[PDB]
Curated annotation (Swiss-Prot):
The gene is PSMD12. It comes from Homo sapiens (Human). The modification N6-acetyllysine is found at residues 205, 352. Component of the 19S proteasome regulatory particle complex. The 26S proteasome consists of a 20S core particle (CP) and two 19S regulatory subunits (RP). The regulatory particle is made of a lid composed of 9 subunits including PSMD12, a base containing 6 ATPases and few additional components. Interacts with ERCC6. It comes from the Eukaryota. Gene3D superfamilies: Winged helix-like DNA-binding domain superfamily/Winged helix DNA-binding domain. This is 26S proteasome non-ATPase regulatory subunit 12. The lineage of its organism: Eukaryota, Metazoa, Chordata, Craniata, Vertebrata. Signal peptide: none annotated. Component of the 26S proteasome, a multiprotein complex involved in the ATP-dependent degradation of ubiquitinated proteins. This complex plays a key role in the maintenance of protein homeostasis by removing misfolded or damaged proteins, which could impair cellular functions, and by removing proteins whose functions are no longer required. Therefore, the proteasome participates in numerous cellular processes, including cell cycle progression, apoptosis, or DNA damage repair. Pfam families: PCI, PSMD12-CSN4_N, RPN5_C. It is linked to Stankiewicz-Isidor syndrome: A neurodevelopmental disorder characterized by delayed psychomotor development, intellectual disability, behavioral disorders, mild dysmorphism, ophthalmologic anomalies, feeding difficulties, deafness, and variable congenital malformations of the cardiac and/or urogenital systems. Keywords: Acetylation, Intellectual disability, Isopeptide bond, Proteasome, Ubl conjugation. There is a cross-link at residue 76 (Glycyl lysine isopeptide (Lys-Gly) (interchain with G-Cter in SUMO2)). One of its GO terms (biological process) is proteasome-mediated ubiquitin-dependent protein catabolic process.
């Protein structure tokens, strides 16, 4: 357009000197007139410098009220250039960072966040400023208010923000929600992160923070399998997989949580996947333990305790123990759940092999009293986990379902089919033997 350029180059140092002398209101009025001229001229580079010089002038002179009023007026000028306001806010957030006085900084943050509300070109600043506000509202107590302030920011919609900073914002939102114990909101916010982003270049810190936050979230609910998956995701990070003290702990937690997960197709598949790892040999006590949950035999709770409890609960100096079975309340609950998993595995094995078993023998093999074993079996039967009929009068447990004539005759027919196939295969093998020795 008219390209003022040097016109503001002449003015700005002069008004800066006058401001240092003490004249500000007249000087800021002169810059208001010059800003009007540039804005009508639509000179982006001149208007941005004018606004930046104005806010710097009101900042260096400690004119906090004047700075806030100038920000309000300059942001609200008619047909203001958006980039000029963006540069002005970018310069003002630096002053926000520099200011250490809490009330002045808070008022300046409020003004900046109210002038940048609902505007795309300053969405990043109002984001970062909000983060700063949240920090101020957390280091001074009142974590609930900081969580509420950072929660309303829909950072996933902010297109200009870098994906890395967006993920950092979501992680901070999740951490604040966890700090106020808002696990439902933590799940809702966790849904906003695509885990594939952690397969990219150097962002392993974000991956570790995200998966630790998810571990904390799922620990409260008790979803052991999800916790095991999260720990397995931590185990695959190159940073953790490069230090023994880190990947060993991660894999210890992986094993201890895949064991705690109730048996299903997914749990068995995960156990098989983990057992294929060779790094388990660096921690045999855990590896053998996993083998104990893979073998199709009875395992005794007393033997399991006397062989692994010290290595799991108290641990060793050479191999530190995870917090999975620590002395805290969560550790005690996980220990009880481990005993439940052991007895349930024993009941599964006893259902595969036994057809009928005495309640006394079942209690003896479960390291439980008759009443405790019967209650556990009843709980399993009601949940349709394991079929069993308890003739309590005779103290008998029947794992054998009544034989449908369809089922019996189908077993007979399957035997016939296998017999015929084996006869054919034997005939072919006989033909090969005839060929070889003729």
């Amino acid at each position: 357009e008219v390209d003022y350029s040097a016109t503001v180059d002449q003015r700005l140092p002069e008004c800066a000197k006058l401001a240092k002398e003490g004249r500000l209101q007249e000087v800021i009025e002169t810059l208001l007139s010059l800003e009007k001229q540039t804005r009508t001229a639509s000179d982006m580079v001149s208007t941005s410098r004018i606004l930046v010089a104005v806010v710097k002038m009101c900042y260096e002179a400690k004119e906090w009220d004047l700075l806030n009023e100038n920000i309000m007026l300059l942001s609200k000028r008619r047909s203001q250039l958006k980039q000029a306001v963006a540069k002005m806010v970018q310069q003002c957030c630096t002053y926000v960072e520099e200011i250490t006085d809490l009330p002045i900084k808070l008022r300046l943050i409020d003004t900046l966040r109210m002038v940048t509300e609902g505007k795309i070109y300053v969405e990043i600043e109002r984001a970062r400023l909000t983060k700063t506000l949240a920090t101020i509202k957390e280091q001074n107590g009142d974590v609930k208010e900081a969580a509420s302030i950072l929660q309303e920011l829909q950072v996933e919609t902010y297109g200009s923000m870098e994906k890395k900073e967006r993920v950092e914002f979501i992680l901070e939102q999740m951490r604040l929600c966890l700090a106020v114990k808002d696990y439902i909101r933590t799940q809702i916010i966790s849904k906003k992160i695509n885990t594939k982003f952690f397969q990219e270049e150097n962002t392993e810190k974000l991956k570790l923070k995200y998966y630790n936050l998810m571990i904390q979230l799922d620990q409260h609910e008790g979803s052991y399998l999800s916790i095991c998956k999260h720990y397995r995701a931590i185990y695959d990070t190159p940073c953790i997989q490069a230090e023994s003290e880190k990947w060993q702990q991660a894999l210890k937690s992986v094993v201890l949580y895949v064991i705690l997960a109730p048996f299903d197709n997914e749990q068995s598949d995960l156990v098989h996947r983990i057992s294929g790892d060779k790094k388990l040999e660096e921690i045999p006590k855990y590896k053998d333990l996993l083998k104990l949950f893979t073998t199709m035999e009875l395992m005794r709770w007393s033997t399991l305790v006397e062989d692994y409890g010290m290595e799991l609960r108290k641990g060793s100096l050479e191999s530190p123990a995870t917090d999975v079975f620590g002395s805290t309340e969560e550790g005690e609950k996980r220990w009880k759940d481990l005993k439940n998993r052991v007895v349930e595995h024993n009941i599964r094995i006893m259902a595969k092999y036994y057809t009928r078993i005495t309640m006394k023998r079942m209690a003896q093999l479960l390291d439980l009293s008759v009443d405790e074993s019967e209650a556990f079996l009843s709980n399993l039967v009601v949940n349709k986990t394991i079929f069993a009929k308890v003739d309590r009068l005779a103290g008998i447990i029947n794992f054998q379902r009544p034989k449908d004539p369809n089922n019996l005759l189908n077993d007979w027919s399957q035997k016939l089919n296998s017999l015929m196939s084996l006869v054919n295969k034997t005939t072919h093998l006989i033909a090969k033997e005839e060929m070889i020795h003729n």
